Amino acid sequence: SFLHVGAQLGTELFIVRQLLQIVKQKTNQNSVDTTLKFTLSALWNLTDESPTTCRHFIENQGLELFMRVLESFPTESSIQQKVLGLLNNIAEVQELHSELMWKDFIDHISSLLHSVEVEVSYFAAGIIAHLISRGQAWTLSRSQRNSLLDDLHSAILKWPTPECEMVAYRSFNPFFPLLGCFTTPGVQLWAVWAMQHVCSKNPSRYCSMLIEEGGLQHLYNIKDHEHTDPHVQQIAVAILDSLEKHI
Amino acid sequence: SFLHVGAQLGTELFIVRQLLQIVKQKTNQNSVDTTLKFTLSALWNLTDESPTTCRHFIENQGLELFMRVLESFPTESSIQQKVLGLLNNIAEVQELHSELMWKDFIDHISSLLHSVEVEVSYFAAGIIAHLISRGEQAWTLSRSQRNSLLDDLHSAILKWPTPECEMVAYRSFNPFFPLLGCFTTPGVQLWAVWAMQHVCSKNPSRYCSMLIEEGGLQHLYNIKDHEHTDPHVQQIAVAILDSLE
């Protein structure tokens, strides 16, 4: 049983509010705790493919609090990873691209792109790619826009093969618009690198999902559009020549 | 994106633990805040049709905490309602039966069984019905209290006025159907059909079609043509049927 019909969304948003409360309080104590990491993971999971909870997170000034946690734990790679994963989920929601147009946020993301932990800079790069995705809606410095595109492209190619699988996905759909951005080599470079990574680590899961959602097409279109970045093209053909073996 | 595969289960159980922490906090303080009852509703909803988070609730001392909530706020309508609703969700899980066989627990539930605010006695009755529905040997406590409760349940339901606004909601009637077959213990049957009738009379657009699609017509109707059935139970059952037509 439960209280009444439709009562679960209210409790979901209430849970988001209370998790933000625990984040704020653990930040005030400077307590990198097991419960703090669990709370950041919970927030990250709840924002997965749910723009309503992303909007509730933003409307409860969650991103300001996440800037604060980034600044109060500058060396904690796990904290940064979970924070940036949630912020990536937000960067995927087009209706809220407006409220990530804030230079303190963009500055912290650009700084975290140069982390020597690929588990951190990967999500920094994802945020960056999904923000440059929108052509300009830029609302800020075009200096910083061009700078961060170039930095995206360089940083991706400086990445090693990760040890674990740094992330999970239930759908490759948010990657498909980033694959058509032939104008922005870094964005599709991040997309192709991430898909390659997840199928290389977990083919059992993501090969079937990548083919079923029609992504082999986006890859094949990149394959011989002659206005393609050699690096993006090489990653695309590698993904194809691995996904072709698996039916 | 999310942390890793299967992380959603860990996140949900962590949420259960933290909500229980908020409950213990606002019970140590005698603070009946908005967030306390919202936490109670959140826990209640998370326990709906999910044996897993109910098991986690029990494993995180949730039973003792909830009865501390009961003993510290004996006048609070919504608080007792939500507590007893979550415990009703626990009671429908057979594997956790032995956990609810606590003496003080059954005592408090039998006390709240006789409360006149139906929003409370209803869920207390649900707990007791599900408990003694599982047989005599399964009752590891005072059998005197068991065979007294299967009468006090019957009596408490007959004295019930019909509720006003939304008291409860269900996603499926499947936990009720095993109760409908307890001809040996007619209080269980009577609670089951009374609940079905109430929810089908206030929200017929949802619940009667749900009841038919889940095949409850056949159980109510078995009660119909099963002779030697309790007269109150039979009355309510044929009543549900005659407009389920």
Residue numbers in the entry:
A (entry chain A): 479 to 613, 615 to 726
B (entry chain B): 479 to 723
Could you pull the original sentences from the published paper?
ZER1 and ZYG11B, the substrate receptors of the Cullin 2-RING E3 ubiquitin ligase (CRL2), recognize N-terminal (Nt) glycine degrons and participate in the Nt-myristoylation quality control through the Gly/N-degron pathway. Here we show that ZER1 and ZYG11B can also recognize small Nt-residues other than glycine.
To understand the molecular basis of ZER1/ZYG11B-mediated binding of non-Gly Nt-residue peptides, we determined the crystal structures of ZER1 bound to either SFLH-, AFLH- or TFLH-peptide, as well as the crystal structures of ZYG11B bound to either SFLH-, AFLH- or CFLH- peptide. The free α-amino group of the Nt-residue forms hydrogen bonds with the side chains of Asp556 and Asn597 in ZER1 (the counterparts of Asp 526 and Asn 567 in ZYG11B), respectively. Furthermore, the carbonyl oxygen of the Nt-residue is stabilized by two hydrogen bonds from Asn597 and Trp552 in ZER1 (Asp 567 and Trp522 in ZYG11B). The main-chain amide of the third residue on the peptide is anchored by a hydrogen bond with Asn553 in ZER1 (Asn523 in ZYG11B). It is worth noting that the side-chain hydroxyl group of Nt-Ser makes additional hydrogen bond with the side chain of Trp552 in ZER1 (Trp522 in ZYG11B), suggesting a critical role of the Trp552 in binding of Nt-Ser. Besides, a strong π-π interaction was formed between the aromatic side chain of F2 and the indole ring of Trp 552 in ZER1 (Trp 522 in ZYG11B), this observation is consistent with our SPOT-array results that ZER1 and ZYG11B prefer an aromatic residue at position 2.
